[PDB]
Design a protein around this motif. Structure first.
Motif, PDB file in Angstrom:
ATOM      1  N   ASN A  70      -5.183  12.256   7.494  1.00 61.64           N
ATOM      2  CA  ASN A  70      -5.474  13.298   6.521  1.00 61.64           C
ATOM      3  C   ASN A  70      -6.938  13.699   6.521  1.00 61.64           C
ATOM      4  O   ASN A  70      -7.274  14.754   5.978  1.00 61.64           O
ATOM      5  CB  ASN A  70      -5.066  12.840   5.128  1.00 61.64           C
ATOM      6  CG  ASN A  70      -3.677  12.262   5.099  1.00 61.64           C
ATOM      7  OD1 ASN A  70      -2.691  12.989   5.186  1.00 61.64           O
ATOM      8  ND2 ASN A  70      -3.588  10.944   4.983  1.00 61.64           N
ATOM      9  N   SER A  72     -10.525  14.444   5.552  1.00 59.34           N
ATOM     10  CA  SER A  72     -11.113  14.731   4.256  1.00 59.34           C
ATOM     11  C   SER A  72     -11.400  16.218   4.203  1.00 59.34           C
ATOM     12  O   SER A  72     -11.593  16.844   5.251  1.00 59.34           O
ATOM     13  CB  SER A  72     -12.401  13.930   4.034  1.00 59.34           C
ATOM     14  OG  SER A  72     -12.137  12.541   3.996  1.00 59.34           O
ATOM     15  N   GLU A  98      -6.519  12.428  -2.516  1.00 53.01           N
ATOM     16  CA  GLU A  98      -5.363  11.870  -1.833  1.00 53.01           C
ATOM     17  C   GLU A  98      -5.213  10.394  -2.172  1.00 53.01           C
ATOM     18  O   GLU A  98      -6.188   9.639  -2.176  1.00 53.01           O
ATOM     19  CB  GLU A  98      -5.504  12.055  -0.320  1.00 53.01           C
ATOM     20  CG  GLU A  98      -4.258  11.766   0.529  1.00 53.01           C
ATOM     21  CD  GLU A  98      -3.008  12.560   0.151  1.00 53.01           C
ATOM     22  OE1 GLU A  98      -2.034  12.506   0.929  1.00 53.01           O
ATOM     23  OE2 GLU A  98      -2.985  13.256  -0.885  1.00 53.01           O
ATOM     24  N   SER A 120      -2.723   2.838   6.756  1.00 52.81           N
ATOM     25  CA  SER A 120      -1.969   4.066   6.953  1.00 52.81           C
ATOM     26  C   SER A 120      -2.020   4.498   8.413  1.00 52.81           C
ATOM     27  O   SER A 120      -2.784   3.962   9.219  1.00 52.81           O
ATOM     28  CB  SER A 120      -2.522   5.183   6.075  1.00 52.81           C
ATOM     29  OG  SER A 120      -2.129   6.445   6.580  1.00 52.81           O
ATOM     30  N   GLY A 160       3.183   9.891  -4.210  1.00 52.86           N
ATOM     31  CA  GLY A 160       2.354  11.042  -3.969  1.00 52.86           C
ATOM     32  C   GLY A 160       1.076  10.938  -4.769  1.00 52.86           C
ATOM     33  O   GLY A 160       0.318   9.973  -4.647  1.00 52.86           O
ATOM     34  N   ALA A 173      -3.702   8.085  -0.428  1.00 53.57           N
ATOM     35  CA  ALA A 173      -3.149   7.476   0.774  1.00 53.57           C
ATOM     36  C   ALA A 173      -3.388   5.976   0.826  1.00 53.57           C
ATOM     37  O   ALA A 173      -2.726   5.273   1.593  1.00 53.57           O
ATOM     38  CB  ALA A 173      -3.736   8.142   2.015  1.00 53.57           C
ATOM     39  N   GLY A 174      -4.320   5.463   0.037  1.00 50.92           N
ATOM     40  CA  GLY A 174      -4.679   4.069   0.153  1.00 50.92           C
ATOM     41  C   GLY A 174      -4.402   3.190  -1.040  1.00 50.92           C
ATOM     42  O   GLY A 174      -4.691   1.992  -0.981  1.00 50.92           O
ATOM     43  N   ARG A 198     -13.502  10.488  -0.019  1.00 51.46           N
ATOM     44  CA  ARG A 198     -12.609  10.212  -1.134  1.00 51.46           C
ATOM     45  C   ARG A 198     -13.312   9.322  -2.144  1.00 51.46           C
ATOM     46  O   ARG A 198     -13.938   8.325  -1.779  1.00 51.46           O
ATOM     47  CB  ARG A 198     -11.327   9.544  -0.648  1.00 51.46           C
ATOM     48  CG  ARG A 198     -10.440  10.440   0.187  1.00 51.46           C
ATOM     49  CD  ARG A 198      -9.003   9.949   0.193  1.00 51.46           C
ATOM     50  NE  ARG A 198      -8.895   8.557   0.606  1.00 51.46           N
ATOM     51  CZ  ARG A 198      -8.329   7.607  -0.124  1.00 51.46           C
ATOM     52  NH1 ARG A 198      -7.810   7.865  -1.311  1.00 51.46           N
ATOM     53  NH2 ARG A 198      -8.282   6.366   0.351  1.00 51.46           N
ATOM     54  N   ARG A 201       0.834  -1.193   0.000  1.00 52.74           N
ATOM     55  CA  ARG A 201       0.000   0.000   0.000  1.00 52.74           C
ATOM     56  C   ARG A 201       0.872   1.247   0.000  1.00 52.74           C
ATOM     57  O   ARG A 201       1.988   1.248   0.519  1.00 52.74           O
ATOM     58  CB  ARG A 201      -0.929   0.001   1.207  1.00 52.74           C
ATOM     59  CG  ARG A 201      -1.809  -1.228   1.278  1.00 52.74           C
ATOM     60  CD  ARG A 201      -2.776  -1.161   2.434  1.00 52.74           C
ATOM     61  NE  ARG A 201      -4.012  -0.483   2.069  1.00 52.74           N
ATOM     62  CZ  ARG A 201      -4.233   0.811   2.239  1.00 52.74           C
ATOM     63  NH1 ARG A 201      -3.315   1.606   2.760  1.00 52.74           N
ATOM     64  NH2 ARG A 201      -5.406   1.321   1.880  1.00 52.74           N
ATOM     65  N   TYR A 202       0.361   2.314  -0.610  1.00 46.84           N
ATOM     66  CA  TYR A 202       1.172   3.508  -0.805  1.00 46.84           C
ATOM     67  C   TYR A 202       1.602   4.139   0.508  1.00 46.84           C
ATOM     68  O   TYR A 202       2.797   4.240   0.787  1.00 46.84           O
ATOM     69  CB  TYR A 202       0.435   4.557  -1.621  1.00 46.84           C
ATOM     70  CG  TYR A 202       1.112   5.892  -1.527  1.00 46.84           C
ATOM     71  CD1 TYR A 202       2.426   6.046  -1.911  1.00 46.84           C
ATOM     72  CD2 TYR A 202       0.452   6.988  -1.015  1.00 46.84           C
ATOM     73  CE1 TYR A 202       3.053   7.259  -1.816  1.00 46.84           C
ATOM     74  CE2 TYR A 202       1.069   8.205  -0.917  1.00 46.84           C
ATOM     75  CZ  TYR A 202       2.371   8.336  -1.318  1.00 46.84           C
ATOM     76  OH  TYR A 202       2.995   9.553  -1.218  1.00 46.84           O
ATOM     77  N   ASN A 203       0.652   4.599   1.305  1.00 44.58           N
ATOM     78  CA  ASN A 203       0.954   5.241   2.576  1.00 44.58           C
ATOM     79  C   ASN A 203       0.615   4.245   3.673  1.00 44.58           C
ATOM     80  O   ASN A 203      -0.557   3.937   3.897  1.00 44.58           O
ATOM     81  CB  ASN A 203       0.168   6.534   2.734  1.00 44.58           C
ATOM     82  CG  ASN A 203       0.886   7.539   3.580  1.00 44.58           C
ATOM     83  OD1 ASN A 203       1.958   7.264   4.102  1.00 44.58           O
ATOM     84  ND2 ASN A 203       0.307   8.723   3.715  1.00 44.58           N
ATOM     85  N   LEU A 234       6.646   5.300   1.212  1.00 48.16           N
ATOM     86  CA  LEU A 234       6.702   6.575   0.520  1.00 48.16           C
ATOM     87  C   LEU A 234       6.467   6.461  -0.973  1.00 48.16           C
ATOM     88  O   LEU A 234       6.122   7.461  -1.605  1.00 48.16           O
ATOM     89  CB  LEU A 234       8.065   7.234   0.774  1.00 48.16           C
ATOM     90  CG  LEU A 234       8.464   8.549   0.119  1.00 48.16           C
ATOM     91  CD1 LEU A 234       9.272   9.376   1.088  1.00 48.16           C
ATOM     92  CD2 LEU A 234       9.287   8.257  -1.114  1.00 48.16           C
ATOM     93  N   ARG A 289      11.835  12.487  -1.847  1.00 49.44           N
ATOM     94  CA  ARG A 289      11.231  11.940  -3.050  1.00 49.44           C
ATOM     95  C   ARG A 289      11.982  12.323  -4.312  1.00 49.44           C
ATOM     96  O   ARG A 289      11.463  12.108  -5.410  1.00 49.44           O
ATOM     97  CB  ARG A 289       9.776  12.400  -3.165  1.00 49.44           C
ATOM     98  CG  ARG A 289       8.787  11.483  -2.484  1.00 49.44           C
ATOM     99  CD  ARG A 289       7.403  11.622  -3.077  1.00 49.44           C
ATOM    100  NE  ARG A 289       6.770  12.874  -2.687  1.00 49.44           N
ATOM    101  CZ  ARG A 289       5.827  12.976  -1.762  1.00 49.44           C
ATOM    102  NH1 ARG A 289       5.399  11.917  -1.095  1.00 49.44           N
ATOM    103  NH2 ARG A 289       5.304  14.168  -1.495  1.00 49.44           N
TER     104      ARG A 289
END
Lengths: 475, 593
Positions: free
Chosen positions: A123, A125, B52, A87, B9, B54-55, B103, A36-38, A56, A283
């Motif tokens: 974060n 929303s 975002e 996350s 990002g 983030a997931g 989201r 997963r990204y974050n 990251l 980054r």
């Protein structure tokens, strides 16, 4: 009913011993199963040290985990990194008020972990623009220079611009001790009907100041309303990016999922921008203007604009994001962007601080754009707006006439300017000048303002409406 | 379809993603985040996700849509409030009760449930049709009586099945045309790539004034419906009067307010004002919200939404132009949209070329303003429309030198130039007449000579006396007032009367909230005639002070001329102004003796 029963499922976490590469604050994995990204990871060092990290970037089966608390000690063979499935997310509850939290959400005091009501995502929303409503009532800050004539309304997000070494970092403590609604001051009904709270957020504070915050909020009564999010200067910078998001998520909880208002404080957003530079350069992004990333404005707005009253929910987040002027120039990207997103500015001035004044608030440039909403008959007294206007006008007259005292001599100044010098001296020395621990109710501060303006004859108070003079000038 | 192969990002590189055109919106992840393909290489396209990321997880399906960023035009678009990329900000709050925007929320841009009354046009079955042909009118609301729907400009063929009159939702397959044997069904709504202008048959030359209702704007510094406009959007200058008078009083048949990245409380103020603004004509009680759509963006809306805010606004405006309605955007703080462009360029790595702004900022601004202009709609019947962009500029620090404000000043013909000082003195509408130029004064002669023949020379005289007084205030500062000649004192007195009772408009009282063009012209005639009679009777007669004290009643009459009720009727008001001028002439004749 509460649908939080979904948290009972256990999710086993993979534990990769495949840290192929290490580069600066990054570590690079391989053969990863759907990274997963974050995603927070519990990166284990060869000796057994757990060292949290945040994913990251992902590429196929490679995740570039960014590691908090430095990187020294991470090898390629023995280190094992474990992926938590989600996350980073703060555990929130209505009874964290009174917990001094670390930068990364762990309570740093001697208390235990928060018995989480929910695990809110960091974060959050964006707030629905149609769901906002305009700031209405005052949120008294106890500071005479700010409450009367730089007033803050519930929902406004007004910064405290500050030089490098000015005591802004103590004005923050003073505000956090003395902040509160004017309803208890009104004394016409139960002012504690709708509770108030604060969520302080120190970013980049050196330990000699973080300990000052902890001591000064413990010793005074402000702790049972505050969620002090301290991260140190030498705490990992990624935690320094996290902390304002942490504090705003706590504020959004306390202000919307519960109902209490909140005056969130973000101390030294310049240090937060400094940490955001490190994230951007990690980054391998090219630096934007001034070295800050080009998206500085986006990640400042995604903090500031998480505040304001809300249609339906009674609560309201009031931001006072304090930030240090890098070299005392508005043109710097951080003060510029913050004043470009926020609803005004409240200067702290080196010139006044060198005179020993406290607080060194510089009224002439400081302004609150939507102050006029928080001023009127319903909230504060009815003369508040005209008192503010007249104080600003007479202060400007005093400043330029103090400039002319050295040019045309004292005796050649018009009687208005002589009275204005006397008013400026008494002003800067008794009204702006406030004891560090002196809580001045907005009504009391207006009483001082009136005791200061009655230097002038009623005719020279042209700025104040006559209907107010005819009932407030003499008392 | 394609799966995510990389995330960093906001950028997200799909894979096995063959078949996605550049700039094609693709739904990313299981939550269906909306991202646009910013760069495609081989079989993998670098998607630039809006929300975002983030997931996101490697392997998450990204599903094509086959449409670039497209607004969703049609009925039901008149009243609602939209964000940058046209997500209805009321339906989002209603179906997902939370204060936040979840989201990947995907509520339809137009309300599907509402049943619209639809009356077909002159196009029968078998009639050949073309892009833009009005094949039916829909009663949207009482203030937009016939929201004339029209075939998408990129469609054509023979009508094979047309729906009879009835109540239809937006998914009811109203019309089916045939082209090359390939049937294609059309609903009450159609979508349009936002970044390409809706085509027109012919783009005429805008030469009909946009009567904002403010006296100074329509008199000295006019804007033409179909023309552009620039405004200093700094706080406290008085932008509120400009926006509210455009959306409340001007002759525009629709308004597209678009706010790019405006501070959250500013958008809260706008969204609380606009529902409670009412229009005195076209009925009595209809709120302006019945004819205006708001593209609202708090500063924390996704950067792509802020960057596409003015584009969606201008595409909605072009839609309401194609129906023949003189719609007029009010783009609030275009400088925030330039900031969004700066962020997109920097994040994309596109090299900055002027104070950090991308190279194409000038080209994008020029194109976006060029999408203005009174134009003949496409297809038939051939009604003409017009889009006006009143776009405020609010530079970073009030510098008014950064390339966005320079480009807007270069391109926008009229720059109404609000001022802070004029606002602190409570001189609303706070127009700074020194700098507020207007290059539409020339093309408007074709309108003036038709039905207000003396207007141009009259405003030239008023402007020249105003500038003469502005210059002569410096002489008054240098040397005492007595050193001025009688004519100079006349100029100063008349221009003070101007600044106090012609430019300075209360705007809140019932008598001068809306100063119509005929009343403005008659007041202009009265004031200029006052200056002319004083000038003549002094150049050939007694000292200025004696006449001024002797004819103070005339000056009071011309000053109180601002109070004449526009509701009294144009003929009655004109007759009253003629009476005032006649009494003027006789009083100056008497005092000349």
């Amino acid at each position: 009913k509460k649908a939080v029963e979904q948290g009972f499922n256990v999710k086993p976490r993979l534990n990769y011993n495949t840290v192929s590469g290490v580069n600066g604050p990054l570590v690079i994995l391989e053969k990863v199963k759907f990274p997963r990204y974050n995603e927070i990871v519990n990166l284990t060092l060869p000796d057994g040290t757990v060292r949290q990290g945040q994913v990251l970037e992902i590429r196929g089966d490679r995740a570039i985990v960014q590691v908090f608390e430095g990187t020294s000690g991470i090898d390629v063979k023995k280190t094992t990194v474990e992926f938590t499935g989600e996350s980073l997310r703060i555990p929130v509850s209505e009874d964290m008020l009174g917990r001094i939290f670390d930068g990364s959400g762990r309570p740093i005091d001697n208390g235990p972990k928060v018995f989480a009501e929910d695990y809110l995502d960091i974060n959050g929303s964006p707030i629905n623009p149609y769901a906002r409503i305009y700031p209405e009532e005052m949120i008294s800050t106890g500071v005479s220079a700010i409450d009367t004539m730089n007033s803050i309304a519930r929902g406004q997000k007004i910064p405290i611009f500050s030089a490098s070494g000015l005591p802004h970092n103590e004005i923050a403590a003073q505000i956090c001790r003395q902040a509160g609604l004017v309803r208890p001051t009104k004394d016409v009904h139960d002012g504690h009907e709708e509770n108030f709270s604060i969520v302080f957020a120190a970013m980049g504070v050196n330990l000699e100041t973080a300990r000052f915050f902890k001591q000064d909020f413990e010793e005074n009564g402000s702790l049972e309303r505050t969620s002090l999010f301290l991260n140190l200067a030498n705490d990992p910078t990624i935690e320094r990016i996290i902390t304002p998001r942490l504090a705003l998520t706590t504020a959004e909880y306390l202000a919307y999922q519960t109902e209490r208002h909140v005056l969130t404080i973000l101390t030294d957003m310049s240090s937060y921008a400094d940490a955001l530079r490190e994230v951007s350069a990690a980054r391998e992004e090219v630096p934007g203007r001034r070295g800050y990333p080009g998206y500085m404005y986006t990640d400042l707005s995604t903090i500031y604009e998480r505040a304001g009253r809300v249609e339906g929910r009674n609560g309201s987040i009031t931001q006072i994001p304090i930030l240090t002027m890098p070299n005392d120039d508005i043109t710097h990207p951080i003060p510029d962007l913050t004043g470009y997103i926020t609803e005004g500015q409240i200067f702290v001035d080196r010139q006044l601080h060198n005179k020993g004044i406290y607080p060194p608030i510089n009224v002439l440039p400081s302004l609150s754009r939507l102050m006029k909403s928080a001023i009127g008959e319903g909230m504060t007294r009815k003369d508040h707006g005209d008192v503010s206007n007249q104080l600003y006008a007479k202060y400007a007259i005093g400043k330029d006439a103090a400039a002319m005292k050295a040019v045309v001599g004292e005796e050649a100044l018009s009687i208005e300017d002589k009275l204005s010098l006397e008013f400026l001296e008494k002003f800067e020395k008794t009204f702006i000048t406030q004891g560090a621990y002196e809580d001045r109710t907005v009504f009391e501060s207006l009483d001082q303002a009136w005791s200061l303006l009655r230097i002038y004859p009623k005719e020279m108070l042209n700025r104040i409406s006559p209907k107010i003079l005819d009932e407030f000038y003499d008392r | 379809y394609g799966a995510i192969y990389s995330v960093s990002g906001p950028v997200v590189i799909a894979e096995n993603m063959i078949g996605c055109a550049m700039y094609e919106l693709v739904k990313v992840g299981h939550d269906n985040l909306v991202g646009e393909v910013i760069r495609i290489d081989g079989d993998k396209a670098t998607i630039q996700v809006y929300e975002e990321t983030a997931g996101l997880t490697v392997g998450d399906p990204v599903l094509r849509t086959g449409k670039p960023l497209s607004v969703e035009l049609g009925p039901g678009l008149m009243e609602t409030i939209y964000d940058g990329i046209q997500r209805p900000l009321k339906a989002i709050k209603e179906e997902s009760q939370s204060i936040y925007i979840p989201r990947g929320i995907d509520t339809p841009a137009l309300d599907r449930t509402i049943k619209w009354q639809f009356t077909p046009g002159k196009f029968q079955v078998g009639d050949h049709i073309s892009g833009g042909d009005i094949y039916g009118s829909v009663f949207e609301n009482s203030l937009i009586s016939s929201h004339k729907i029209l075939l998408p400009p990129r469609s054509r063929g023979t009508i094979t099945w047309i729906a009879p009159a009835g109540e239809y939702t937006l998914d009811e397959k109203i019309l089916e045309v045939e082209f090359d044997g390939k049937k294609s069904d059309f609903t009450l709504y159609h979508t349009w790539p936002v970044r390409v202008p809706r085509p027109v048959t012919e783009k005429l030359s805008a030469d009909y004034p946009l009567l904002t209702g403010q006296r100074v704007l329509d008199a000295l510094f006019p804007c033409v419906q179909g023309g552009t406009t620039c405004i200093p959007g700094a706080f406290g200058c008085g932008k509120t009067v400009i926006s509210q008078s455009l959306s409340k009083y001007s002759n525009s048949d629709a308004i597209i307010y678009v706010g790019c990245g405006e501070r959250g409380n500013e958008m809260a103020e706008v969204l609380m004002e606009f529902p409670e603004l009412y229009t005195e004509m076209s009925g009595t009680k209809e709120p302006i919200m019945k004819r205006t759509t708001l593209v609202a963006n708090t500063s924390n809306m996704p950067v792509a939404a802020r960057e596409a805010s003015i584009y969606t606004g201008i595409t909605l405006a072009e839609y309401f132009r194609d129906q023949g309605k003189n719609v007029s955007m009010i783009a609030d703080s275009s400088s925030r949209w330039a900031e969004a462009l700066r962020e997109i360029s920097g994040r994309l790595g596109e090299m900055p070329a002027d104070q950090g702004f991308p190279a194409y900022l000038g080209a994008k601004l020029a194109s976006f303003y060029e999408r203005a202009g009174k134009a003949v709609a496409l297809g038939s019947p051939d009604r003409t429309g017009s889009v006006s962009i009143v776009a405020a500029v609010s530079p970073a620090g009030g510098d008014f030198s950064d390339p966005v404000t320079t480009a807007t000043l270069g391109i926008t013909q009229v720059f109404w130039g609000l001022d802070k000082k004029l606002a602190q003195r409570k001189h609303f509408p706070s127009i700074n007449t020194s700098v507020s130029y207007s290059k539409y004064t020339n093309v408007l002669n074709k309108f003036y000579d038709s039905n207000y023949p003396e207007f141009p020379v009259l405003r030239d005289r008023m402007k020249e006396i105003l500038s003469n007084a502005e210059e002569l205030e410096q002489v008054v500062q240098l040397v005492g007032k007595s050193a001025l000649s009688d004519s100079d004192k006349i100029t100063l007195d008349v221009a003070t009367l101007i600044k106090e009772d012609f430019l300075q408009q209360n705007g809140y009282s019932t008598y001068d909230a809306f100063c119509p063009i005929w009343k403005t012209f008659d007041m202009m005639r009265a004031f200029i005639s006052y200056h002319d009679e004083a000038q003549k009777a002094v150049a050939n007669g007694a000292n200025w002070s004696k006449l001024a004290d002797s004819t103070g009643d005339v000056k009071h009459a011309v000053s109180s001329s601002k109070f004449f009720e526009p509701s009294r009727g144009e003929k009655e008001v004109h007759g009253e102004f003629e009476k005032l001028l006649s009494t003027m002439q006789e009083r100056f004749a008497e005092s000349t003796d």
